[PDB]
Structure 1
Amino acid sequence: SSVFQINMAGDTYWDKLVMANDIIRIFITPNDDPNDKEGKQERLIQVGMVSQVSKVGSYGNDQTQFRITGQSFVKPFMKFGLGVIQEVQAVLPEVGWLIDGDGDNEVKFTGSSAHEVMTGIIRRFIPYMKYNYTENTIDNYLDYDDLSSWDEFEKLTEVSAFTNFDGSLKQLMDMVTARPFNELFFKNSEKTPGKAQLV
């Protein structure tokens, strides 16, 4: 889990303004512009989703501040829990599906490599995770491409959706990763500044 915190001044009532789950981008200027130093790049330092805003202040010391904290796009997956539905038959009159694991909420993901499986896992749930962005969803802001793994040594896989009882997609993401043989983390996209990337 990657987490960040921001301290804000008390000039304005931020509690009524900054609604939860907003996206904040931070840019840091390393050195002087006109000097023509290599540091003049406006490199993005971190981007993530806020998940908490709180008043703070010790009036004994005569000072107050507002604090905002969030995580770098780990919030959607971690919160999205693949739950289990117990009492649904989903039958049809004198018709049925030839593949098994149908009618019920079972979903099977198959691939001969992690990049094949992980594509199917992410693509299964990412679009429908909708939000109120004025412009899109997480698929535009997260590339989740250029994935690879040991395709030659890994056979075909039948990884099940519900391997973890009512767990998060991160819990199911760990199984697909098969650590420590493959490294998974969230980091800024240097090749495409302004947006994040799942590695």
Structure 2
Amino acid sequence: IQEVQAVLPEVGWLIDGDGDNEVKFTGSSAHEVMTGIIRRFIPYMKYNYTENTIDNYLDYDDLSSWDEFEKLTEVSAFTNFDGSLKQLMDMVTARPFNELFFKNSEKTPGKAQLVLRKTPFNPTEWRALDMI
């Protein structure tokens, strides 16, 4: 949005990036950032379901990443000009070091799950995958 001041009479906000639509997400790991990113917009995405919204049908939990090697992050909402949340989701993912995809929830049949985990090419993480 280009032409919105959002001022107030003789009052103002101490944090910068206020009045304007700027939003900042901060976390020391991908699961901390991705939680804030998804949780920021998911509830308000409303639909005409007789029973809820996407948050009941998508768990988007049990996320992890390289917390020890990744410092604190200041990822900006508008890093991509009028892009989709998927475009902004890719930046948070930091591929190929972390693997993001949508797949059925075997642990909870009947509903889908958003997966965000460190790549399984590590030796112990490779053994952690279920064999078939």
TM-score range, shorter chain: 0.7 to 0.9
1:153 positional shift = 0.0
Structure with the larger strand share: 1
Tell me how far 1:133 sits from its aligned partner.
0.0
Aligned residues: 115
Q: 1:104: how far off? A: 0.0
Larger relative helix fraction: 2
Query: 1:104-123, aligned counterparts within 5 Å?
Result: 104-123=20-39
Instruction: Provide structure 2 residue ranges, at least 5 long, that are not aligned to the other structure.
Output: 116-132
| Structure showing greater relative contact order (alpha-carbon pairs closer than 8 Å, 6 or more residues apart) | 2
The TM-score normalised by the length of structure 2 is 0.87
Offset, 1:101? 0.0
- If you compute each CA radius of gyration, which structure gives the higher value, 1 or 2? 1
Alignment partner for residue 159 of structure 1, among 55, 61, 75? 75
**What is the Cα deviation at residue 164 of structure 1?**
0.0
Supply the distance in 2 between the matched residues of 1:130 and 1:180 (Cα, whole angstroms): 32
Q: Identity percentage over the alignment?
A: 100
CA distance in 1, matches of 2:38, 2:10: 35
Alpha-carbon separation, structure 2, partners of 1:146 and 1:195: 15
Give me the whole-angstrom Cα distance separating, in 1, the residues matched to 2:39 and 2:83: 18
Q: Deviations over 1:115-159 (max 9, x none)?
A: 000000000000000000000000000000000000000000000
Write out per-residue CA displacement over residues 30-85 of structure 1, whole angstroms, 9 at most, x where no aligned residue.
Answer: xxxxxxxxxxxxxxxxxxxxxxxxxxxxxxxxxxxxxxxxxxxxxxxxxxxxxxx0
Paired with 1:159 and 1:95, the residues of 2 have a C-alpha distance of: 28
| Structure 1 unmatched runs, 5+ | 1-84
Structure-2 separation of matches of 1:159 and 1:125: 16
Which ranges of 4 or more aligned residues in structure 1 deviate by more than 4 Å?
A: none
| Deviations, residues 145-191 of structure 1 (Å, cap 9, x unaligned) | 00000000000000000000000000000000000000000000000
Aligned-partner Cα distance in 2 for 1:125–1:157? 19
